[PDB]
Design a protein around this ligand. Structure first.
Ligand SMILES: COc1cc(/C=C/C(=O)O)ccc1O
Length: 162
């Protein structure tokens, strides 16, 4: 059933690019995600309650797409059976030039993200398109506000840690 998201809602995923950076998605409900970035040019950025389009595209393969207050567009694949992540990000030009102004708990700064969005140039768009490896999966249930509740910089240096 392509409309059944039972196997996905509640998922807490750690995925890891080939350079070793860790990323997190928590699938909060059938149209909402939390995420948390650890490393890189937008390291420590995190986000709660992102409205998203979450569909099922294979037996244990899911897709999540959304648009961000910065002007960024995201479309990702979570293939749970093959432990395979794939992400496409459509970054406005301003974000490529100054990725650090998106580094915050975005929920506290949505007007600021919109202000930056309206200003620095939207174009040309940079498409970043990249596989990662799913390195850890948990189930935390739907609507669990305790899954993603701090910046990555507040987590154990040990991370991940079950
Ligand atoms: C090879 O470079 C990478 C670029 C990105 C895009 C990242 C982001 O927005 O955090 C993610 C992981 C990477 O390994």
């Amino acid at each position: 059933d392509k409309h059944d998201l039972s196997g996905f809602v509640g998922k807490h995923l750690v995925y890891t690019y080939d350079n070793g950076w860790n990323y997190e998605i928590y699938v909060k409900n059938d149209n909402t995600i939390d995420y948390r970035i650890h490393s890189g040019l937008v390291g420590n950025r995190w986000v709660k309650d992102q409205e998203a389009y979450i569909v099922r595209v294979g037996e244990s393969i899911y897709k999540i797409s959304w648009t961000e207050p910065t002007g960024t567009d995201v479309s990702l694949i979570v293939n749970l059976g093959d432990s395979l992540f794939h992400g496409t990000i459509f970054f406005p030009r301003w974000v490529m030039n100054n990725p650090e102004p998106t580094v915050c708990f975005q929920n506290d700064h949505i007007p600021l993200m919109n202000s930056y969005r309206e200003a620095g140039p939207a174009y040309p768009t940079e498409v970043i398109d990249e596989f990662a490896t799913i390195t850890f999966v948990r189930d935390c249930g739907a609507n669990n506000e305790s899954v993603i509740a701090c910046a990555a910089s507040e987590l154990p240096k040990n991370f991940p840690d079950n």
